[PDB]
Amino acid sequence: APTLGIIRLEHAKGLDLPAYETAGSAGMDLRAAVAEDRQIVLLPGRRTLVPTGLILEIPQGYEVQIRPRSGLAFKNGITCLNTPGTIDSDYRGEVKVLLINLGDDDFRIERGMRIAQAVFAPVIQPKIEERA
Amino acid sequence: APTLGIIRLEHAKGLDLPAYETAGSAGMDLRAAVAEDRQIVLLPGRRTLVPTGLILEIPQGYEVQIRPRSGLAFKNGITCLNTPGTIDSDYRGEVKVLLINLGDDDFRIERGMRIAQAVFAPVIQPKIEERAKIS
Amino acid sequence: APTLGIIRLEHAKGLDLPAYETAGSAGMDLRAAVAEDRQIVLLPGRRTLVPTGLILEIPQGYEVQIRPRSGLAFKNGITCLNTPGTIDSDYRGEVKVLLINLGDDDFRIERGMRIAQAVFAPVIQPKIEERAKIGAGGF
């Protein structure tokens, strides 16, 4: 099995590492690493980039997809706007989740809230051949 | 090849099992297993769960992704809000599809309508190693 | 490595083909093949199907996923409405990207603009077995 490296930045240190819940799980929940005293309200129609405080180190040949939580999508109409979000094996910046409120409630985002799921997947760079 | 188990519930009566159209197909189309003599109305901005009438039995090591139907996205602005929806090997509920109307017309959901596609894939759980420095 | 064939239609003449930025890139950017000195102005809440002028010949056992660019989603609220758009190995039509504007400002699509990314990956088909009796997936 490949190894996924995770660095917790300072604002993610008090939150758990991502992990698979069971041997059957497809993904790992990611949480909002906003400050405890800086909760936000995502208004209907609006979008916001939510920090996780994580840097991912994905080996060559793999990617991580950032997918929506189904519960939040159903209950509140919240989703990830750029889904599935593509984290490259090459990326060493912080992973951030772009949420959009496509419902009609004023949705509160708080530190520690589960906001998305990460799925680790193979990816290939094919030879690209122009043809007639 | 791995085997995907499918249970058809009673309200899926008369609807075929999902199947791949060809050896080249990446996904299987799912249909709306809603009551036969009713149209469900999905107004602009609204979302709703649509039953497929299927329980999937996905073997450990694999997942199913639920992806949008392109034709309904183009023609009516309809999509799957939580796309790509993740169904794991633990899940044994009925598969439901979360549609949202991001167009300007009343959209009518009818029995048998194709509403999404299912893509079956292996899933990998990498070893998670916390690191203090960029490698 | 497998080979992705790309046939260029007339309106993609003059444009760079899709290519990976680095050896670690998961996706390669797709460009709008609208006529030069033509524009698509996409108003808030509207969707439009943007031509790439490319046909992909993907070999069997693989698919291409059309996914959104993160920068357009963040900066403009633009996304791919049918994401991830599946292109299978049987598909020989022109690739067209279905953009929707979920932001507040107009979004102007111009020739050559990078409007999506394509991710190439293996795909499998399981055997399907009907059963009578008996996790992410529920709501």
Range of the domain at C104: 1-139
CB contact under 8 A, C102 and A100: yes
Total number of domains in chain B? 1
Q: Say which CATH number the domain at C22 has.
A: 2.70.40.10
What are the distances in angstroms from CA B105 to CA A47, B100, C32, C75? 24, 12, 27, 28
Nearest to C115, CA basis, from C131, C101, C130, C104? C101
Residue B78 · residue B97 · CB < 8 Å = no
- Cβ-proximal residues to B70 (8 Å cutoff; 6+ apart), any chain: C82, C85, C86, C98
Q: Note the residue count of chain C.
A: 139
Coil, strand or helix at C53: strand
- Chains in contact with A via at least 3 Cβ–Cβ pairs below 8 Å: B, C
What are the DSSP calls for A22-76, one per residue? Answer: STT-S-EEEE----TT--EEE-TT-EEEEEEEEEEEPPTTEEEEEE--HHHHHHH
**Residue A43 contacts C, CB cutoff 8 Å:** no
Q: H or E segment at C72? A: helix C70-76
A84 cis-preceded (ω within 30 degrees of 0): yes
CB contact under 8 A, A1 and B126: yes
C84 cis-preceded (ω within 30 degrees of 0): yes
Residue C132 · residue C49 · CB < 8 Å = no
B32: closest CA of chain A, how far (Å): 17
- Cβ-proximal residues to A58 (8 Å cutoff; 6+ apart), any chain: A4, A5, A64, A87, A88, A89, A91, A120
Burial of B18 (0-12, 13-18, 19+ CB in 10 A): buried
How far apart CA B55 and CA A131 sit, in angstroms, is 43
CB contact under 8 A, C124 and B88: no
Coil, strand or helix at A108: strand
Q: Tokens 């936000």 map to which residue? A: A40
Cβ contacts of C124 on chain B, cutoff 8 Å: 1-2, 120-122
Cβ contacts of A22 on chain B, cutoff 8 Å: 90
What are the distances in angstroms from CA A91 to CA A115, B135, C24? 21, 12, 8
B3 is in an annotated binding site: no
B58: closest CA of chain A, how far (Å): 10
- Cβ-proximal residues to B38 (8 Å cutoff; 6+ apart), any chain: none
B89 is in an annotated binding site: no
Nearest to B64, CA basis, from B86, B32, B48? B86
Q: Which long-range contacts (CB under 8 A, 24 or more apart) does C36-42 make?
A: C36/C111, C38/C111, C39/C108, C39/C109, C39/C110, C40/C108, C40/C109, C41/C106, C41/C107, C41/C108, C41/C109, C42/C78, C42/C99, C42/C101, C42/C106, C42/C107, C42/C108, C42/C109
Residue C124 token pair: 């499998």
B19: closest CA of chain A, how far (Å): 23
Q: Tokens 């190995």 map to which residue? A: C89
How far apart CA A100 and CA A112 sit, in angstroms, is 18
Residue type, A1: A
Rg of chain B over CA atoms, in angstroms? 17
Nearest to A12, CA basis, from B124, B131, B135, C75? B131
CA–CA–CA angle C123, B92, B71 (5° rounding): 45
What are the DSSP calls for B66-109, one per residue? Answer: EEE-HHHHHHH-EEETTPSEEE-TT--SEEEEEEEE-SSS-EEE
Nearest to A14, CA basis, from A59, A68, A52, A45? A52
Burial of A44 (0-12, 13-18, 19+ CB in 10 A): middle
- The coordinates were experimentally obtained by X-ray
Residue C116 · residue C29 · CB < 8 Å = yes
**Residue A20 contacts C, CB cutoff 8 Å:** no
Nearest to A122, CA basis, from C18, C1, C96? C1
How far apart CA C69 and CA C27 sit, in angstroms, is 10
What DSSP designation does B126 have?
Answer: P
Backbone angles phi, psi at A74, to 5 degrees: -65, -55
From its phi and psi, is residue C81 left (phi > 0), alpha (psi between -120 and 50) or beta? alpha
Element counts in chain B: helices (H) and strands (E): 1, 11
B119: closest CA of chain A, how far (Å): 13
Residue A9 token pair: 């930045």
**Residue B58: closest CA among chain A residues belongs to which residue?**
A24
Coil, strand or helix at C71: helix
**Residue C96 contacts A, CB cutoff 8 Å:** no
What's the resolution in A? 2.1
Interface of A with C in 62-81 (CB under 8 A): 63, 70-71, 73-75, 81
Give the count of beta carbons closer than 10 Å to the beta carbon of residue A94.
Answer: 16
- Cβ-proximal residues to B37 (8 Å cutoff; 6+ apart), any chain: none
How far apart CA C87 and CA C71 sit, in angstroms, is 23
Interface of A with B in 104-123 (CB under 8 A): 104, 117, 119-122
Nearest to C65, CA basis, from A2, A119, A5, A18? A119
